[PDB]
Design a protein around this ligand. Structure first.
Ligand SMILES: [Mg+2]
Ligand SMILES: [Mg+2]
Ligand SMILES: [Mg+2]
Ligand SMILES: [Mg+2]
Ligand SMILES: [Mg+2]
Ligand SMILES: [Mg+2]
Ligand SMILES: [Mg+2]
Ligand SMILES: [Mg+2]
Ligand SMILES: [Mg+2]
Ligand SMILES: [Mg+2]
Ligand SMILES: [Mg+2]
Ligand SMILES: [Mg+2]
Ligand SMILES: [Mg+2]
Ligand SMILES: [Mg+2]
Ligand SMILES: [Mg+2]
Ligand SMILES: [Mg+2]
Ligand SMILES: [Mg+2]
Ligand SMILES: [Mg+2]
Ligand SMILES: [Mg+2]
Ligand SMILES: [Mg+2]
Length: 62
RNA sequence: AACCCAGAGCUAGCUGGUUCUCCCCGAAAUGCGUUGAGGCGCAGCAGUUGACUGGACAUCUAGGGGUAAAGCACUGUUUCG
């Protein structure tokens, strides 16, 4: 048969690899995994609530 | 305000750590607000993608100010006769 288990493959641009952060600096995303220095967005856990404005009265209340 | 076990991998806007390679582009430490000030949101500045534009550099001209300088005509201050 023309098509066979060992002559197939995906269309280019259809299946990217996926960023494996924390696997060196040459990979691109560094050791900090692309979150900068220490802060609140860089911590392991739930972040700020979407709409939160640092104690400022958010737009869904004013 | 005992010890052991469990809820419990409690929570930690705080420390520390986060592993292979090459190529291209490439910041910001400013403003507003905040039970906020070593945090966050938006704007500003990056990258990438798309659309619409033709400007940028240089030269000349025009337009309104009230700084430097200058001055004592006003407001104050001041020397001598
Ligand atoms: Mg880098
Ligand atoms: Mg390292
Ligand atoms: Mg990132
Ligand atoms: Mg660190
Ligand atoms: Mg940050
Ligand atoms: Mg947290
Ligand atoms: Mg929630
Ligand atoms: Mg833990
Ligand atoms: Mg619990
Ligand atoms: Mg460069
Ligand atoms: Mg600052
Ligand atoms: Mg600067
Ligand atoms: Mg308040
Ligand atoms: Mg208050
Ligand atoms: Mg602040
Ligand atoms: Mg701050
Ligand atoms: Mg810092
Ligand atoms: Mg803090
Ligand atoms: Mg921001
Ligand atoms: Mg002057």
């Amino acid at each position: 048969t023309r098509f066979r288990l060992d002559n197939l493959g995906p269309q280019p641009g259809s299946r990217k690899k996926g960023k494996r952060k924390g696997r060196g600096h040459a990979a691109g995303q560094g050791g900090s995994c692309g979150f900068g220095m220490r802060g609140q967005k860089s911590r392991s856990g739930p972040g700020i609530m979407r709409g939160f404005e640092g104690g400022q009265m958010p737009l869904y209340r004013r």
